């Protein structure tokens, strides 16, 4: 009876079994879920308005979308998994459901398919760019969650440094891979950076004041505005520390937030780089490129 | 001041800002708290000992040394606070007191950073090998925390599969790295994964017998045997559901494993496997290489 | 001294004592309890509707409703306890009050004091139902905690194997125990099993639709038609198994169950259950019987329309 | 598909199905568990030492025996539940391993089963002495379980009759199930009686002094005594009431028992009851029996002195 | 090195050092943290409604109500901190935060900061009401203490006499210091007593029916009306041993309250007290003193109709 | 029904009750466990060493003895509720029994008793020293805990006024309360108070030669000495904040002191402290009192 069995195991051992689709299915689970929620899909947008300047083939622009998306639902399966959040497109997290050993090994899993999804286009390039986005993504999400933990509030340089290694990456990360099989190289790069922030910097006001980061301690641009320019009081730290669910918090937070008039700071910041980025997009169509006007309603749709 | 601030975003848009030592010295606590601790070190003999046929230069001995180990580290990390436990080479593990988050990214981070040192080489044969391998490792943990979550009871040959996956992967991979700069050009991975199978085997053997699989709800080869060897007593998988920590349960889940004669099947399933391992070496050494002592150590150091 | 004490033990040796009201008072606390709170009483009806076929005197219809409530008010007893349930009737439980083991000792005394109850008909047949109910009885409770402890999804016979021993024996042991004393004597079996299975597939639809089986972990007939029908998706085991109490989690539970179409099933099963109920109630009439107008209605009361 | 299904199911209302080992072997898991470990199985023999007496054959012993090993087994395992126990004859409790649920449903079910096996002598005498038997087990668990939680010191007289109840029935039911068969009429019930209240005494005695009852807050014979000697003391009642498992306390309380003189009394009071239980076994020979060594090896087994 | 530090010793034994402020303030932390949270301050309406009758000056009240103050605030940390409390006037408890040790300490050092106080009136009569006083508040406490934790319901009498124990001496106490200078010798205890007896049955009630008395298991007034009324029923005692923090249990114990009727009952009494006041107060005024307002509103203010 | 309840609770505000024994004995319980105990009752051998001066009647003398007996008993079972200890007198603390509630209520209402006790003498001074010396032990034992517990490490001098603080003042209660009625009239408080910090200081030198010191976390004399100096390794501090009961925690520990050489310290600390002590009932010998030889024997008894 012994033989028999370590017969089989050496026999496997020379020839390796073949991976089946059942345990694919498996350990693809929560990525399944969190991919079937319905979404706002702003980065498919973001790709087809640079293929008006690119004009690059179809199937090149399938695969990125494709990697884009493996990345984008990995990071936020993580990111969920991180801060301790409870809701995400107003449905259960997929941690609530599945554990979070399942969660995170189904996002590493993915990390590691989307590399092997890049090699398919036979150039070192694009891994160079795909290991350089993965560290800045990284980098990011230590610096977020360590600000977070420590309870130490960040300055500004330091915070908008932080937003460009965990947001601005994977758009970064999308034009550069789409600019390997087209004729256009220009530099594209500052656009994209300016975009990123504004993308950011607009998703911490409309999240507040058309408030789950004060359940979850979360340090935005306007609390740390509030934070920094009135050292006077220590009410704001204390409730961030809190994590309440009270609304008594809540509207205690929001009438602090108003009285030291953040908002319309974050306006002027906006509108002062909203100007810049419309200037930056006018200075690249003078170089030999055709008007967009994908990009400007992308610019215009969002606003404060 | 809002336009001395505006000027210094775009400004580090334009041109991006360089990472830092006090930053990256934060990013990898966890990797070092548990780098400082010395351990067994058996992969370091491992290529230390296959060098002998291989005969390679020093500095990329290093560089792979370098690259297991913090792959290994990394793993420990992960599978540590996926699996709930509490000590890690006789000191508290690091998740209880950085945190999780922090650990989960320093893996993460380690992970990339191995990437990184790899492109160093400049051969695409590398970045094949670092993926597959990276791959198998997920998929091995995956199967290992669904077993384990949903509890059904693995046969022999999925769980070597599994084993194969999670264990074996390292052993291949820091192989198949020194082959690329040796002038011998032969096949050496099944005695690899055979090597590895045996080393996972002895593990789970000695954990119990010289219990915290017990504890936590393992699947190990002795626990499998005892469960499937009579299949209408359900004793033991009930106690590895309750997930105890009292001593009587212990003693009584060893007693009923010795009941059922366990610990004398995997005694002869190493024999058997050294012996077959034994003569794959003998093979090898007939086409041209020589006797290697290191190799005949570490295997017969091993033996149950 | 000593010698007193010993003296009233061998007495009490020789003589034992006789049983009190105040002891009795307490050992029956949850028991009066759980009573004490109003309830459906669906038994009551199911016993006088079978009442017009067979016409026994007053007597004996008192003495077997009171055994079957008894029964009944144990067995709830028993069942709230092993499922961790924390209300029932609105009600705290009674175990959130006196404990577990006064819980406990209740139940398993008003069965033994049911069993008494029945040993005054003078009848040997009496006992014989008496006993194989309380087995099948048993047997159900332990196959269901089984499952729902050890996480094997069963499949639906089996599922109903277990319903018929859980639920239908009360109602097979309610009907014998007329049929002492009745001139007619034909089979009743068939359609109290089948109207047992149909009470158990109404209640378990309209816990969760009109949803604590999510909370404790229950297997349910759509939660098994739902975790059959797609086998490669792992989310309603996974939802059971955490044990959630959280209403976004029931929330996503239930539109899984109507993404895969469970409720239409039940439905639709339910709808030939109810046919071929009416078929045999027909043709039991056409034997010699009259029309039932009260089976009639406890029938048509539970259509899932 | 679902036409199948429901043909299925009717089907299976008109010819129900058979019972599987399969399903047994599963429902009667904690019991094999606990029937495994050896145990000194005291009742084995005084089964044997009245044998001398009634001269009964000997398949009726073996199924007497069989009856009293499953009660008493199954009153075992729902004791260790109810007194939140940690350890049985050296090894982990029940419920430690397969739960509460499983392990209750379990002692239920050997209990229905024990008296299916009686029903096969073709006697109603049996059922009744099992059913009286069983309504004072649970008298007796009842109250010890009420008295434990409510912490109030019973008297003397009071845990006696408990003691009675809980002990003495299964010794009751043994020795009369013999004598459906045996051609000796007399009177045995007062000696069996008294010999129950010497086992439960000597193993309160024994379990302290050769300490889990004080782990336990349990009220046995010594501590009643100790408690009640001195009402204006409530340190042993604190200790009870703390319920801690530390080495110090035991020791403590062990101390002031000593103070008090209890395990003297104990000893006394066995004496003058072994005295009367000889008396009475010497009364019985002079009716027309002969010589029992066996029951006198018994009695002189369970000596304090 | 060892002769100076030994020349310091010795400087320090023959001149003992002076005590100073950034340790005063350190000892005095969770007095000064209940002290700042605001409060009904009633004593102060208390004592402000007798100095009508006896005209003292202001520096002697001044002085007679900071003991009293310190003394009521001491009381609530103590009993705080033993009655396993998690909220004081709507704030968390002050031995969450700066532990338990040091509200101990705190509120004993308080308690003899206002002894060395009362000193400086220069009468050995303000020391004796001082030291009594004291003695009966701790007894109070001691016996409600006791009570609770070896789970007896005391009868009507004994609690009226522990509510008098352990609420009325500080009432009696402050009345009697401020007649030391005063020039109106009448007595007034009676008085006091009935006021202080009036404000616990009113805080009783007013706790629950306007409910952590049912999650601390403390026995009230009306609950031990409704454990007393019907003996045979073991619900109330139950959920008081419980210790439960659902709002369930806590539901059903009023309702379980309501239906025994006993909130009438303490509204009857209440009512019946204050007339009972009222004519006390009628009767002292016919002596020679003039019409008092304030203690007619404070005793109009306490009426539970 | 209500009128009998109403007509009884009026009698009784009208004439109040009478206390009873039998609420006495369950008030007065968890300290009647404690004073069955048998002690080394040295303060009845230093009192009885004063009265060979002051040759004061026996009436006094017995009430002095139980008034301090009364409360060195309340303050040892406040002291064991305070510091979280597990035996005394090798035999179970009083509060593992009662619990905290009854055996403080019980150390607060002897403490009053005692107090009661003291009126009888019919003299203000009395009812000065009595306020006084509790109020000193009360700023003792709160300064001491609160150095326990916030982990700050006072120095020498400080300690040692704490340690006459709540030590000292029971020794100097006694002598005082038993001058009232003698002749002799000159100063004995400095040799009270020099004798007070010896005994302290040699108790606690015999503690760690005679342990749960340092798994409670006290800091004793050469505790102290020894972080002062080697103002540096925080080994004893962090030592002294595990709490940990192990033989090893403790076995370092030890050694850790004895690096130090603490006992020389102490040593000599005690020998001077002696010194000065036998001088200084050399100088009071002078102004006409009798050879005493109770007190030498009773300083030779304890020392070093």
Not at 32 to 40: A, H, T, V
Not at 125 to 141: M, N, P, W, Y
Request: hydrophobic fraction near 40%.
């Amino acid at each position: 009876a012994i033989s028999d069995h370590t017969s089989r195991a050496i026999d496997l051992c020379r020839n390796p079994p073949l991976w089946g689709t059942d345990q694919e299915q498996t350990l693809l689970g929560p990525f399944e879920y969190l991919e079937s929620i319905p979404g706002k899909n702003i980065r498919s947008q973001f790709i087809e308005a640079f293929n008006t300047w690119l004009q690059i083939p179809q199937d090149h622009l399938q695969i990125v979308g494709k990697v884009i998306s493996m990345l984008h639902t990995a990071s936020l399966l993580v990111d969920d998994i991180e801060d301790n959040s409870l809701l995400r497109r107003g449905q259960p997290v997929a941690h609530s459901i599945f554990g979070t050993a399942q969660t995170f090994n189904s996002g590493n899993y993915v990390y590691f398919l989307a590399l092997q999804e890049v090699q398919k286009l036979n150039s070192p390039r694009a891994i160079s760019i795909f290991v350089d986005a993965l560290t800045q993504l990284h980098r990011g999400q230590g610096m977020d969650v360590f600000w977070r933990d420590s309870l130490i509030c960040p300055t500004e340089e330091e915070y908008l440094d932080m937003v460009a290694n965990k947001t601005g990456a994977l758009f970064c990360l999308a034009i550069e891979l789409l600019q390997i099989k087209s004729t256009v190289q220009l530099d594209f790069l500052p656009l994209v950076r300016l975009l990123g922030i504004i993308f950011q910097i607009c998703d911490d006001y409309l999240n507040l004041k058309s408030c789950e980061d004060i359940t979850e301690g979360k340090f935005s641009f306007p609390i740390i505005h509030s934070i920094r320019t009135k050292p006077g009081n220590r009410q704001l730290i204390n409730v961030l520390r809190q994590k309440s669910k009270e609304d008594d918090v809540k509207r205690f937070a929001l009438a602090y937030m108003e009285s030291t008039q953040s908002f319309d700071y974050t306006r002027d910041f906006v509108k002062i780089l909203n100007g810049e980025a419309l200037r930056m997009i006018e200075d690249l169509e003078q170089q030999g490129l055709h008007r967009n006007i994908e990009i400007r309603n992308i610019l215009a749709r969002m606003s404060l």
